[PDB]
A = this chain, B = another copy of it.
Amino acid sequence: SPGIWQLDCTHLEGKVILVAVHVASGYIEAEVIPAETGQETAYFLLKLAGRWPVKTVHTDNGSNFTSTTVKAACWWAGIKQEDGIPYNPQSQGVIESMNKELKKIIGQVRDQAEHLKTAVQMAVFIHNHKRKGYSAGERIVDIIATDIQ
């Protein structure tokens, strides 16, 4: 559980926002990309796994699950690549709610930057720091530290 992440792809302004969610905490990293290719996804996972102890990634769709470039990145970074089938139906709902919340935050900041990428990084910051009371940033560190110990 401390090492489980889920990929999520959402769309805004004719661009793609790729999101990785740490399942147990709700902490996220995200990036804007032109389109969701195997290479973009592979590079994103490489970045993520260099920054956090990524044991398993539930991929966001079958194309990323199939992609040999994505499999190659997961091999390189020691990540177990898995499907993202919502065996628990609550998973779809959680992802959908997160995309809605993220788009809400982007709207709230959208006028503070010219470029969508900047707004998305502001949204990451706000999401990770929001207290609901601990924040997702606090939760992820505590979960992982407990695991190390």
A residues in contact (CB < 8 Å) with B: 29, 43, 46-47, 49-53, 76-77, 112, 117-118, 121-122, 124-125, 128-129, 137-138, 141-142, 144-146, 148-149
Contacts of A144 in B (CB 8 A): 141, 145
Are the CB atoms of A50 and B125 closer together than 8 Å? Answer: yes
- Among B50, B52, B112, B146, point to the contact of A121 (Cβ < 8 A): B50
Are the CB atoms of B47 and A121 closer together than 8 Å? Answer: yes
A25 CB to closest chain B CB (Å) equals 12
Chain B residue with minimal CB distance to A148?
B138
The docked-state distance in angstroms from the alpha carbon of A141 to that of B50 is 14
Contacts of A148 in B (CB 8 A): 138, 141-142
